[PDB]
Design a protein around this ligand. Sequence first.
Ligand SMILES: [Ca+2]
Ligand SMILES: [Ca+2]
Length: 237
Amino acid sequence: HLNVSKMNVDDEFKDTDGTFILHDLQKDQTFVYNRKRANQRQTPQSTFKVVNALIGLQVKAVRDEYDVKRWDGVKREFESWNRDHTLGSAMRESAIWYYQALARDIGEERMKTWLHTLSYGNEDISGGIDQFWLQSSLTISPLEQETFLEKLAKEELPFDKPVMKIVKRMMIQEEGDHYTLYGKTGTRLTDMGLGWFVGFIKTEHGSYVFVTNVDDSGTKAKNITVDILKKYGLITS
Ligand SMILES: [Ca+2]
Ligand SMILES: [Ca+2]
């Protein structure tokens, strides 16, 4: 019976500058490691795919998690990007080009309205409709990400219920007998110097929202998170 207020995660951040937030939804309690960094707005990277997918489905710029966009044949850095993608696979593989096409179809006026309705960070898309989340104008703090994700977990955002169910399913990372891990990585892929892993874990006793943010890659952020979630008995089997 975890009391998140009594946690310690210092060791899991060995050799890394980062922050971690865990919100126990059933008890309405939040643990924060490195509160100063938790309050620092940073560029969201591919964690923005969560918001982009919600808006895109809501406004019918994409149909469902299986909405296919054909690859243009341009060889990009990661072979996993060099194939036809859907909304869901491009989230799983962080295939930026798919979400750039989606953002263009949403369009700047609609995107700006939605980020204001959602109070998403600094709401600043001036870096360009298909660039603004990629080490660019938009920023959001780890605590602001947690506030947004709690509303998604509780289905309190201004989106249709089926839209939120689709995006949550798209976030599933791992399923055990006793838990389901949902999450999205983000990385500043130029220098690998900023990383995120944000999401939720559902157990038999309740759900938890987490945000991990680090001066390292999104893969490192995810590995730190999984280490913590195992240490505290939320990832079991
Ligand atoms: Ca440890
Ligand atoms: Ca380091």
